[PDB]
Copies of this chain bind each other. A is one copy, B any other.
Amino acid sequence: GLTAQQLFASADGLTYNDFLILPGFIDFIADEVDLTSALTRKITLKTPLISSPMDTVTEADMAIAMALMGGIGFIHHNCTPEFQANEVRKVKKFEQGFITDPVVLSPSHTVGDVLEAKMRHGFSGIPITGTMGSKLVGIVTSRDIDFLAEKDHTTLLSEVMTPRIELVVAPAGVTLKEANEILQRSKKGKLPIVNDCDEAIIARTDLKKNRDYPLASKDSQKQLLCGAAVGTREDDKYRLDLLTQAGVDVIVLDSSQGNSVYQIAMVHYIKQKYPHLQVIGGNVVTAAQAKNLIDAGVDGLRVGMGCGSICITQEVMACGRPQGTAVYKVAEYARRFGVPIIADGGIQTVGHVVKALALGASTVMMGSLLAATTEAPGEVKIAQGVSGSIQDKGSIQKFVPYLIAGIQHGCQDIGARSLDVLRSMMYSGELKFEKRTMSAQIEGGVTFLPF
């Protein structure tokens, strides 16, 4: 076949469908290939898959799911800054380990107020001055509240709490694993971490979820990694603070055409106000474009212009690049400076994901391929997109594993035991390509139900 360099020296407009990969020597099982990949210069993920920040794709629910499956979710603009910050708060509060700021109450409150807290925040389990300085009086939970009816709005916590002397508690200074051990071998669900003066909390739901989700992408504090997209205008500097107060780990600068003085200024702003925050540059399709955002200190580069399944940018603008050529030509340069690429748009099926991953992309952000799932949101001003529709596609819980299995099988029967080794062979020529004619693409095709 043809090496990547020889394939892309043709100067043709090679998208993904314009070439294939010649298979290799299988030497391992379909479940042994490692999918480890980097979302950012200082964030590593188990699943290279990402969810694109669009109004009908990525909100708190999709971010929760995609962080549980080892990926990540980026939240969108079509909402108020307060709404975006609230969604990020939900994402980071889904699974938390140390519950350092419970929904605390004072013994003067009422079971009706406990029910109100259950509705508004979701938790029926809340410890009972009503601040993070109160020596425990007790705890309330579903098993203390549930049977009460017609009397909740008139019953003090006095009649239903658990007096602390009956509680099991732990000291302030024990590590998380030790607190988990004390919780596990206490046959109870909540272990308040208390100070020597008797003034955080760890739950069992977090451990059950750690069981249920082996690949969940968690931070150093056992909270789901979350990201957010911040614009380039002046107003964006209040949105950025309102959200970074929520602790977003990575931000993608949202812009159709990335290379500009404006995004460079926004970078120089972020990388000087919050030096520990990780940034992703704007959509570039050229090494000359990416040079500026790399010199600006950016840690990752979104790649793709006009190749979206919902994007008519080429039609309306006469600018862009073929998807696969852009991805290869940009990643071959970004790789020189440790900057992950993200192939955005153009991905219709798992073969496209595998092609993009082999072409240099350290991760892959997808849009419409993830839309219409049960977790997705919903049930002059020249335009650049179409208000399309997609058929129902089920839950991410069932869908993402299909993609992971497909990528692993592809790596198996292409001969790569890891997504790093795959790229190594590609950049060393041990992996081979061949172009496809329209008749060949016709040949390679055809009630289909993969699961």
Report if A435 contacts B (CB, 8 A). yes
Determine whether the beta carbon of B402 is less than 8 Å from that of A319: no
Determine whether the beta carbon of B289 is less than 8 Å from that of A23: yes
Report if A312 contacts B (CB, 8 A). yes
Residues of B contacting A278 in the complex (Cβ-Cβ under 8 angstroms): none
Report if A158 contacts B (CB, 8 A). no
Return A305 CB to nearest CB of chain B, in Å. Answer: 7
Residues of B contacting A24 in the complex (Cβ-Cβ under 8 angstroms): 259, 288-289
Contacting chain B: which of A39-47, A192-200, A347-355?
A347-355
Docked CA distance A323–B349 (Å): 22
Query: Would you list which residues of chain A between 400 and 451 have a CB under 8 Å from chain B?
Result: 401-402, 404-406, 409-410, 413-414, 434-451
Determine whether the beta carbon of B208 is less than 8 Å from that of A446: no
Determine whether the beta carbon of B260 is less than 8 Å from that of A11: no
Docked CA distance A77–B13 (Å): 43
Report if A382 contacts B (CB, 8 A). yes
Determine whether the beta carbon of B321 is less than 8 Å from that of A22: yes
Report if A104 contacts B (CB, 8 A). no
Report if A256 contacts B (CB, 8 A). yes
Contacting chain B: which of A94-102, A127-135, A384-392?
A384-392
Contacting chain B: which of A64-72, A143-151, A295-303?
A143-151
Across the interface, A444 reaches (CB within 8 A) one of B142, B306, B351, namely: B306
Interface size class of A (residues with CB under 8 A): 35 or more
Return A119 CB to nearest CB of chain B, in Å. Answer: 14
Residues of B contacting A201 in the complex (Cβ-Cβ under 8 angstroms): none
Task: Determine how many copies of this chain the complex contains.
Answer: 3
Residue of B nearest to A412 (CB): B257
Query: Would you list which residues of chain A between 1 and 15 have a CB under 8 Å from chain B?
Result: 1-2, 11-15
Determine whether the beta carbon of B26 is less than 8 Å from that of A437: no
Return A27 CB to nearest CB of chain B, in Å. Answer: 6
Determine whether the beta carbon of A439 is less than 8 Å from that of B143: no
Residues of B contacting A12 in the complex (Cβ-Cβ under 8 angstroms): 435, 437
Determine whether the beta carbon of A318 is less than 8 Å from that of B285: no
Report if A176 contacts B (CB, 8 A). no
Report if A36 contacts B (CB, 8 A). no
Residues of B contacting A354 in the complex (Cβ-Cβ under 8 angstroms): 317-319
Determine whether the beta carbon of A448 is less than 8 Å from that of B11: no
Determine whether the beta carbon of B259 is less than 8 Å from that of A387: no
Docked CA distance A441–B306 (Å): 10
Determine whether the beta carbon of A20 is less than 8 Å from that of B259: no
Interchain residue pairs with CB less than 8 A apart (11): A13-B19, A22-B321, A142-B208, A256-B413, A315-B349, A317-B354, A319-B354, A319-B410, A322-B443, A345-B443, A382-B405
Q: Top 6 nearest A-B pairs by Cβ distance?
A: A26-B260, A380-B405, A318-B351, A318-B354, A13-B436, A257-B413
